[PDB]
Amino acid sequence: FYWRAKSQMCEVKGWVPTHRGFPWGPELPGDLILSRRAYVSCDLTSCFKFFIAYGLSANQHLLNTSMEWEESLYKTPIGSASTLSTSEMILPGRSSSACFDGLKWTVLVANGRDRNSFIMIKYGEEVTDTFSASRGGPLRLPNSECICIEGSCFVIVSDGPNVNQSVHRIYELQNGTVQRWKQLNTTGINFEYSTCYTINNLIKCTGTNLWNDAKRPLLRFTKELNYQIVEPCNGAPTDFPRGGLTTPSCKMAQEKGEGGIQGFILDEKPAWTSKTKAESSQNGFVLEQIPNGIESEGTVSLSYELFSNKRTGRSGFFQPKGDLISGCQRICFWLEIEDQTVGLGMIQELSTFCGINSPVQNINWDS
Amino acid sequence: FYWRAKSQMCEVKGWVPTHRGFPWGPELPGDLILSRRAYVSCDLTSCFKFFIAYGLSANQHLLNTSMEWEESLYKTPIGSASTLSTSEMILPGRSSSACFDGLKWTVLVANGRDRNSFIMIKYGEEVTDTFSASRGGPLRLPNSECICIEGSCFVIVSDGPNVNQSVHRIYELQNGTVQRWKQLNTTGINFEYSTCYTINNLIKCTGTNLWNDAKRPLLRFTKELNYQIVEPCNGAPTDFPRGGLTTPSCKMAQEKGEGGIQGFILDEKPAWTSKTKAESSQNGFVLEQIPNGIESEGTVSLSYELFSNKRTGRSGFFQPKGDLISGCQRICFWLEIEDQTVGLGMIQELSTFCGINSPVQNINWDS
Amino acid sequence: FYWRAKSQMCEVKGWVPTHRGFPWGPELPGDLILSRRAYVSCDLTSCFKFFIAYGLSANQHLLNTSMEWEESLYKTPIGSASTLSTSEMILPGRSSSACFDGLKWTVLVANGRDRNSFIMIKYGEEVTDTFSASRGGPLRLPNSECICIEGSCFVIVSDGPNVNQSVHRIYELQNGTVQRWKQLNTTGINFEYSTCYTINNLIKCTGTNLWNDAKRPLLRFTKELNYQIVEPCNGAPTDFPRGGLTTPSCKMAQEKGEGGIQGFILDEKPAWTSKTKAESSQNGFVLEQIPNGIESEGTVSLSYELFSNKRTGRSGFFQPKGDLISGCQRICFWLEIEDQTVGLGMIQELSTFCGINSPVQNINWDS
């Protein structure tokens, strides 16, 4: 009676937006909480945006408050703008993860800048657990939904002061309580900003290598925490920044591998890849289907240019949990759309897209 | 246990407003979402306004945002003003239709400008289906409630680049999923802006001919999609624009037939007709009873001038679904009231009127 | 299972405020709906303010809208300020009455200025009945809660163009549907602004005589509509305007009998009387207990000066319906408190007071 994915993932032949971002910019209404590190996650009924607040607007500018350095996590329904009257403060935190197990929300937040850093866990309204940095901190949560299968919830936690040598662990939770953890062998790479989905009792995640790779590393693991980390084997890297296309291999792409941005790869057969339109700008977003999976040479069948000119940012998976018509498990993603404002710089608003089995035209969503 | 109309339609001897529009103009409060292509539709408990947002007010003017060209459908309870805190974003879309089958909302939206145009369907929160333009697009939904009978939902979809030769289809849906469609034979006419109701297991609709008619074409069909299209046989055309009264016949009225505006005809015996007060202005709204039905010569018995001077616009049917006192099926309509503002031009607000069996005075609702 | 009063009314030895009015003036927040002809009425769970809107504030002034002459009834929870986000539009109307029968709300509104005047009735969300003026109009509802006993709801409806010769009827409703009505014999008086309560299967009401009396006429009737109209027999009139104390008798007090303001008398033994502090100003509010009932000579035992200086206005009864601790039926009243504003003249806000069996000090509620 706890939640678990439907037995098979739906075929995906295209992606339709279920929500464009609230279309702010160059102006925006007062009383809006401005957000970063937002992601979406759903209960059995509807979906919510989870986010770190960093400011509140009024007259086109930021209210001078302490919101930027006193970081707290908030929640807002997907269908509502993020105002004070409509958003709820959940916990203090600078990064986070959240997921509904069918019964209650499990919410994790990290606080503290270095060795003082620690993670708190909430189950429903009740704080149920804590743990500390083990490798110098700061502890870092993914800013994407954690993954629940039949009452067990899994999240990737990062540690270490440098991308030089980060440490990453899978924590397994029940009732908001750590049952165990496994340290991953990630020698030679960096694996931040994990975004994940579940199917076939497995959990799959796409990382961001901020150290030495413009391709995105992939993690796959079971509920017993047996795992593998693999590299995409095409020659089209998907991080930003990145370099140009190279010949397909299983090697990392190290040209411009430094830095990066949260993003995802649908690790199925067919596999889908996603990235900005060009390598020179954070503009547009392109989804490409690879029939033979991400460990093939990468031959692209379908290719959708969902955004062409609009500046874009982080993206990640989320899964609908209470579908009643689909016999199969749907997959969706959230994506930051970036808008310039007149009075408070650049802002991020989430759009959401879901996979559908039926094909569709290459519509540009800029307008 | 799915919804179906009560067995007989209530006698209608007059129309009372159940909601005047929010009385904005020349001024209006900040944080209001300004709307177009609004209509109402109800669940088993209360009623909602569905609409395409095109702007957000502040200090009497439009916030410069991207709301106008990034079109999304929203929903607000009938009894509330359409503010950010109270309205919910449902789906991206430039035209739409919505209807509650007794269990969940079925919502359709159309997006794309020409051959890229396509329709998405939502059942509850779950996107359940899509289909594309077949005749060049854009696909166009009615902007009025779709019609559900015992779990099957019906809506009219228009296609084609010109009113010159539009194509129109009835789509039949279950669980937000297309079961079939039938193309209508509409050679020689144009049938947009369909607004519909159901009674006696039938569905009846009034169209707007934007090509060659100032009378409104009428569609009647069964759940097996057997249908007929008939022309009103009076000599008093009800579109706007239109020309003067002519001698009653079953011919179309082609004087000023070009263009038009969504509107309705209650296709019963007696039939009710509805139109602006005069042919020269979009002012007032007049409801006229024709005892012998719309295919008679049109002799008018009752005649109510609900608005005299106030500028008016689109209108359409909606049906209450959870009446518990009435033994019979009530019928209502929504109507745009147009208000001039000081700082953002002309706006539309919906009023709603319902039929009652008891007669009433010819009150003018301007004030 | 329909609602009915508890078998006996609680002893009342004093009155405590359960809500002061929102303390606006000289300033008030923007987005507030300004109200008149407000009263309170309760479901089985909590209580609501019902009111006619006449404006919306912004920057201390009235938004220039059409709200004043397009009158609509709204509802707001007692514990909330009356903003757009929190208030609900119910029906168009210039006067009204409302009452919950245990199952649904029955709501009546009157619209139209003279012979066109008519009343509409809502049961839950469903309009269930209408009737017209019979004596020239306008039809007038009390602006206080109607009274429901075991599924039958009663309200006083006034008619006629002059206080010179008004006509008053009791309408009996079930499911928002008129079952019958009885015209009262009110020759020689005027009986507007009825405010009522129920106990012992009876319904009792206090009127306002706008024609020839500064005492308040009292109506008492049964569910079979057998009734009596009696005059208070003290010499202390309670209308405003009024003249000074006179010697106790059953005669009307005609000095300054012209005009008046809605108000109440608790018609029990002991009886309670209520009025402004002095006859020269609408200031303060005084409640006086008369052990021998309102048809005695009026000897006053308890006397509470609840307000001394604050300007006050209309007042009326309401009854809590879902008490679970009290074995007896409580009685409360609402009272307008008048506040001067800097930018939109004088406003009215409701306070609510309830009777308690325990005595209490003569606290002044001005501050």
Add this chain to the structure above:
Amino acid sequence: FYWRAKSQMCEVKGWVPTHRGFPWGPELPGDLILSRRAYVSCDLTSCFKFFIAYGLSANQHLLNTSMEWEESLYKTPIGSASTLSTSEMILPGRSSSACFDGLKWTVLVANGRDRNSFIMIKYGEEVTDTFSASRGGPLRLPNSECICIEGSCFVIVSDGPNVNQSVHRIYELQNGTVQRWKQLNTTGINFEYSTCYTINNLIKCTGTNLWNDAKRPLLRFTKELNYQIVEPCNGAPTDFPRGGLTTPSCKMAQEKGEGGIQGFILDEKPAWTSKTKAESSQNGFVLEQIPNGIESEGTVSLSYELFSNKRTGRSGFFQPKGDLISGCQRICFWLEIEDQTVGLGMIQELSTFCGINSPVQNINWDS
């Protein structure tokens, strides 16, 4: 089926913030209700801030209203800012107490300045009881949650015109109705601002001595109202103002004993103490663990500096009531954080911290 504490209190090895205060200052949004004498209390599902309103913001300043001297109690969910749209007016009052017994809220408020002073009690929405000052008034409620065990609710009520000789009583309530009261023998001390928790069918409270003590007096009592009042036996006083450390004894600390501020002591073994960082300023907040209990010499094991520089104020206990994971009873506290504003002086916002059994780093929560 009424609420009672879990059988044992959880071990507490540290304190984590479950909510930082809304980070206002130097600026804050309009439409905010500014509050004082706030505390938190929970139902079986979530938690609420209870508070006395004293103003409403707009454009960085206080709206000139009557809110400051017409004092009313309000309630807001912990996770929401305290705006008009989101806060609910409960009762008029200048001090208060509230507690959920598992079924309904019991709410007490005090009104009146001296001998007219009295207390009103609400059970759910129903006013159920009243009583008057017995020793000259004003009656004073604690401004912290009252305590419910199995349907009986207990609160400390203070009386008397001077801290010179205040009188304090325990009132026992059921269904919002006083069953009895016991006067405490508090000769030689003053015991205001009681903040309390329950465990082991006992109720424990920490007072504030505004007369002659910089240590905090402690009250412990049973449901039969057998009680004891004891003095902390360390030499580190916790009131503010206070003097420096002295040698441990059971004597009161009278240096700077005059005045004080609401605050708490966790009266267990180990005991926790809490106070500002230094004696010279109301800055920071420090929690210190005393393994041997508050009646020992006070040897400190753990010591957490939760705030260092930030100005702080009142603090008190609250208990979560609907935990489902913890087998034991959790304990939390609320704490005022003080922020300077540009346009309305100094404000107070509540943060909440809960005890956890796992240890944690000495993180500074200033930023």
